[PDB]
Amino acid sequence: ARTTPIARYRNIGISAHIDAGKTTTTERILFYTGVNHKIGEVHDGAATMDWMEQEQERGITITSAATTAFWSGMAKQYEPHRINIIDTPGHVDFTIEVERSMRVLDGAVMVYCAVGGVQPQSETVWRQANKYKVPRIAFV
RNA sequence: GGUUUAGAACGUCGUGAGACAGUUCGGUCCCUAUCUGCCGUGGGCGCUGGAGAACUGAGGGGGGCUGCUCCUAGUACGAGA
Ligand SMILES: Nc1nc2c(ncn2[C@@H]2O[C@H](COP(=O)(O)OP(=O)(O)O)[C@@H](O)[C@H]2O)c(=O)[nH]1
Ligand SMILES: [Mg+2]
Ligand SMILES: [Mg+2]
Ligand SMILES: [Mg+2]
Ligand SMILES: [Mg+2]
Ligand SMILES: [Mg+2]
Ligand SMILES: [Mg+2]
Ligand SMILES: [Mg+2]
């Protein structure tokens, strides 16, 4: 019946300031789980999540897009977990979208830049996550 | 080709011949370079005995233009775009 046990389900979001690497980190996720044959770059519009023509041309995420993966482990340590990742936007022009995805998800991976670190949109996603008390981790 | 020759016509001016910063069609553009100048190329002599070659280098000339794509780099800057 149920393909994967309830414990092996992750509904996660990738939230942070504009251009912290969120859309790339999602491409490298879809790559290390084999679902996409090409790595693709955000600047060259190759990114699958950036499907809208505006997203391809301007290299920005103007919407939330959802994808799935099967991450066994680094050494196949665990049984394949079905991670539902909905890539989100960081532009203040689209905050409803990040809160929209943020509410349902059980965890958030907050991207950051090593040069800048805490940025305005990073505080914005922080306050939004804190009000909904989502458990968080961070990726620099 | 235009402008300004001789032909002809329009409009206008004049009685007229003709005329118009008015127009219209047609209408002969010569020279074998003496000298300077310049581009080449040699003959004479000189450089102190004659000759063959290899050069130094004062000086002179030639050349000096730039686009686009990628890497750095979505890097610095920018809340962003
Ligand atoms: N140097 C470098 N550039 C990165 C890295 N991750 C992403 N980028 C680039 O930085 C830009 C912004 O990243 P992106 O994933 O589009 O951010 P998002 O729009 O917030 O999801 C894009 O041109 C990416 O290719 C990284 O680790 N290093
Ligand atoms: Mg993005
Ligand atoms: Mg005659
Ligand atoms: Mg010269
Ligand atoms: Mg010279
Ligand atoms: Mg580029
Ligand atoms: Mg950019
Ligand atoms: Mg723009």
Folded structure, characterized:
- With 140 residues, the protein is an alpha/beta fold.
- Helices cover 27% and strands 21% of the residues.
- It has helices spanning 22-32, 53-58, 96-104, 120-131; strands at residues 9-15, 65-71, 81-87, 107-111, 136-139.
- The chain has a five-stranded mixed β-sheet with strand order 2-3-1-4-5, with helices on both faces.
- The longest helix has 12 residues, at 120-131.
- It is globular.
- The termini are far apart.
- 26% of the residues are buried.
- One magnesium ion binds at residues 19, 59.
- It binds one RNA strand of 81 nucleotides through loops.
- GTP binds at residues 16-23, 87-91.
Globular, elongated, flat, extended or rod-shaped: what is the shape?
A: globular
As a percent range, the share of helical residues equals 25-40%
The largest sheet, given as strand count, sense and whether it forms a barrel, is:
5 strands, mixed
Bound small molecules, by name, code or SMILES, are:
guanosine-5'-diphosphate, magnesium ion
| Secondary structure tally: strands | 5
Distance between the termini: 39 Å
Q: Count of DSSP helices?
A: 4
Q: Provide the gyration radius in Å.
A: 15 Å
Structural class: alpha/beta
**Helix and strand succession?**
EHHEEHEHE
Portion of residues in beta strands equals 15-25%
Strands across the major sheet, in which order?
Answer: 2-3-1-4-5
Binding site for GTP: 16-23, 87-91
Subcellular location: Cytoplasm
Family: Belongs to the TRAFAC class translation factor GTPase superfamily. Classic translation factor GTPase family. EF-G/EF-2 subfamily.
Protein name: Elongation factor G
